[PDB]
Amino acid sequence: GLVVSFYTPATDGATFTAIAQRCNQQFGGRFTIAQVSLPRSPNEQRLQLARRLTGNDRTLDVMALDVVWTAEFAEAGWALPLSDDPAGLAENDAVADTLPGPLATAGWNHKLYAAPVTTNTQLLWYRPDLVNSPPTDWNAMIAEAARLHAAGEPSWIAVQANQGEGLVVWFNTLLVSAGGSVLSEDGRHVTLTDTPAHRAATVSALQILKSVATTPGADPSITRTEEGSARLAFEQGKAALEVNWPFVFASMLENAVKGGVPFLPLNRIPQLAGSINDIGTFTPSDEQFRIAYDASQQVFGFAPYPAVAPGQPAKVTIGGLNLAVAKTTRHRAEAFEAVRCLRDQHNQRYVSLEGGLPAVRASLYSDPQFQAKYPMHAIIRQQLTDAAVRPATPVYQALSIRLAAVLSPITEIDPESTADELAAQAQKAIDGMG
């Protein structure tokens, strides 16, 4: 029958293809979900979607939107409110058995404009064979990296943060962790330097950025403007400390079985031969997962995101993907039905245990079966409960562009003057300037 297009980031394409295919089996020919890949960066994802929307591409049906785009797509009329579902089932489905943090990312003006499908929060990953105890705050991160450098051991702090949204996320986590905020609640005012407490928080976050940037054993690519990957930098053995989203777990094991991780030769374990399936995905038995995880645990561990202040946890910036229905769709009913299928319990378990992307269904974090294959579950749920949030505003694209331009390169940050420049650029963003 008809075709419901389903646009997702390229990196997650394969995963959302599998899910889509399963859902197609459940429809029996009534309609077919067809996954289509967007570019890698959130900015480019947004740009492709917005060009199709303003161009009235009537073949665009369902969008996997980054959490930071809701506001814009809601206020422009691009993402239909879930109340526009002709069946009237979308809102109740979206809230049922769904964690409140992601739900909050999917709303605008007290209405839901998308149904959360995946969420995200950054954890600390470390080499336990080189780091005796995972650092609990950023001062300890710095000290541990310096110690590793003084010993000829891999000394990088692999943070997914170049000159784009990753750097803004890093800064936002440090800022909210110190009690600060980019914008006011209503999104109408810049709150980086408007009070002494707010300015102090901003200055603390910037000092952490500058100190990490100028720690001996730093990756020489902090000024060399490229697009390196913290995941790969850790997998190649150049970093003993990484902060990144949980999918790196699924990466480690998988690439370790493929022979791509030098310090973790899971490819040399006979019991794991053939655990990579015919399309390149690590799909172990229960026994094979036990073997792989046990071997991994000697050189690969995880821990909470490092706090900025000793004594209490960090407040970690939430990310993820919400399923929105395009205003361009010719088939609202089928599009919302597809959304409901793509986020069901089976497909949530799949998106986590095979795609590595944290699920939004609360039940799964209370599911021992799920917990056995997703060992980061407790820290993830805890950080999702106390999550930091990037400001929700229709001008988020320009705001993030300007903030990243000020923050980069982090080696040239001067906390006081940089705080003032961040405030000025954020004010330009919310004033209407991009």
Ligand SMILES: NNNC[C@@H]1O[C@H](O[C@H]2O[C@H](CO)[C@@H](O)[C@H](O)[C@H]2O)[C@H](O)[C@@H](O)[C@@H]1O
């Ligand atoms: N760190 N900020 N950069 C983008 C964000 O990271 C996340 O999205 C990106 O990383 C995940 C990996 O789990 C991919 O699935 C996404 O496709 C990729 O864009 C996060 O979920 C986003 O909200 C952030 O903006």
